[PDB]
Amino acid sequence: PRGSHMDDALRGELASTIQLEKLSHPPARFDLLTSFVYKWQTKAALARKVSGPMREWAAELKYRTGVHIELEPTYPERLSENATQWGAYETADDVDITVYLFGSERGIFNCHKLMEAAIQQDPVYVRLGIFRRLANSSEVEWLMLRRINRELRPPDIPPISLKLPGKWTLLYERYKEAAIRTLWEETGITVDASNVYPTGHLYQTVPQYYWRVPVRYFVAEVPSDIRVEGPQVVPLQYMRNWDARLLRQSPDPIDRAWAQLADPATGCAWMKASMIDQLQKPLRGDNYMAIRYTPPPYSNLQEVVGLG
Numbered sequence: 001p002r003g004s005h006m007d008d009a010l011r012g013e014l015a016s017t018i019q020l021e022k023l024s025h026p027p028a029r030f031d032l033l034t035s036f037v038y039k040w041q042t043k044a045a046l047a048r049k050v051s052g053p054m055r056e057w058a059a060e061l062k063y064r065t066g067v068h069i070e071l072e073p074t075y076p077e078r079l080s081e082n083a084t085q086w087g088a089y090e091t092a093d094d095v096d097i098t099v100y101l102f103g104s105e106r107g108i109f110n111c112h113k114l115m116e117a118a119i120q121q122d123p124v125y126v127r128l129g130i131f132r133r134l135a136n137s138s139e140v141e142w143l144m145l146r147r148i149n150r151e152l153r154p155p156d157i158p159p160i161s162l163k164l165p166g167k168w169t170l171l172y173e174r175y176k177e178a179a180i181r182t183l184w185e186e187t188g189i190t191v192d193a194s195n196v197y198p199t200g201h202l203y204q205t206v207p208q209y210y211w212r213v214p215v216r217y218f219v220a221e222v223p224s225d226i227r228v229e230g231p232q233v234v235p236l237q238y239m240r241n242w243d244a245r246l247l248r249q250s251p252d253p254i255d256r257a258w259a260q261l262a263d264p265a266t267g268c269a270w271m272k273a274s275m276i277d278q279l280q281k282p283l284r285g286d287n288y289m290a291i292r293y294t295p296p297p298y299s300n301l302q303e304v305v306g307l308g
């Protein structure tokens with residue numbers, strides 16, 4: 001019942017081999033979905049590529065074929081263990097996951113080959129660090145957004161995410177291609193692929209959070225004078241039309257900094273790296289921007305951005 005609701009929410013933002021096993025009927029726990037049902041016994045290293053933290057790719061597979069993807073840890077009691085067929089999993093990739101498919105065999109056949117191609121790639125989150133240089137200052141300003149995540153979310157996703165632009169790679173989409181397209185979807189800024197530079201990737205997960213995906217990072221300079229329109233895809237899902245008087249007095253530092261630098265008409269804000277890491281210091285430690293958005297030397301840009 002929760003899996004469907006999350007797939008319905010992503011509909012607005014949508015525009016070596018797999019051994020399936022047909023099941024006579026589904027287990028009683030999955031009858032409400034029941035329409036055939038096929039099972040795929042795999043690991044989280046593979047099942048993560050057809051689901052996603054917010055069911056990004058499980059919803060696209062439904063948008064494509066009409067099949068419903070349902071995932072469950074095969075032996076979830078092992079995820080409650082600290083220290084073999086039983087005990088704590090070594091890594092998240094090793095977590096046994098059982099995937100269920102619901103729909104017509106026509107739609108299941110289409111999704112099956114889509115899934116066999118999905119598990120071949122590396123689907124990740126992308127963040128294109130958009131920055132501009134200030135004539136009066138020496139440091140750069142980065143464009144920040146605050147997305148209001150939905151109620152149906154995994155426990156590792158906050159209610160509001162202070163983020164730089166960027167979403168996720170669609171099925172068969174590539175890193176830079178996703179970073180540029182998702183940049184416009186969240187900001188409305190058009191950046192050329194020759195000015196986008198990869199700055200690194202991060203993957204930190206635990207077995208209990210088997211769904212977590214790597215994050216590929218990019219940076220690109222924007223002209224200091226530019227019309228930042230804000231989110232054009234699902235704009236209601238971002239912090240907008242807020243009230244600067246009362247939020248300025250919120251006990252959250254993010255919130256106060258948002259009331260002072262954010263524009264409620266666009267939901268966007270320009271922040272310096274020293275300000276972003278100060279905001280991320282109590283949650284992430286030091287060097288939040290430097291760890292993620294340090295340009296490669298061939299960009300001839302780590303001099304300009306200031307992290308280096």
Ligand SMILES: Nc1nc2c(ncn2[C@@H]2O[C@H](COP(=O)(O)OP(=O)(O)O)[C@@H](O)[C@H]2O)c(=O)[nH]1
Pocket residue numbers: 053125127157161162163202203204205211212213214215292
């Ligand atoms: N949000 C999110 N973060 C992840 C996921 N998987 C890994 N991470 C970690 O997120 C850290 C950096 O996150 P950040 O750049 O602040 O993006 P954000 O956490 O999604 O706002 C990295 O150390 C990654 O290991 C995921 O599926 N979702």
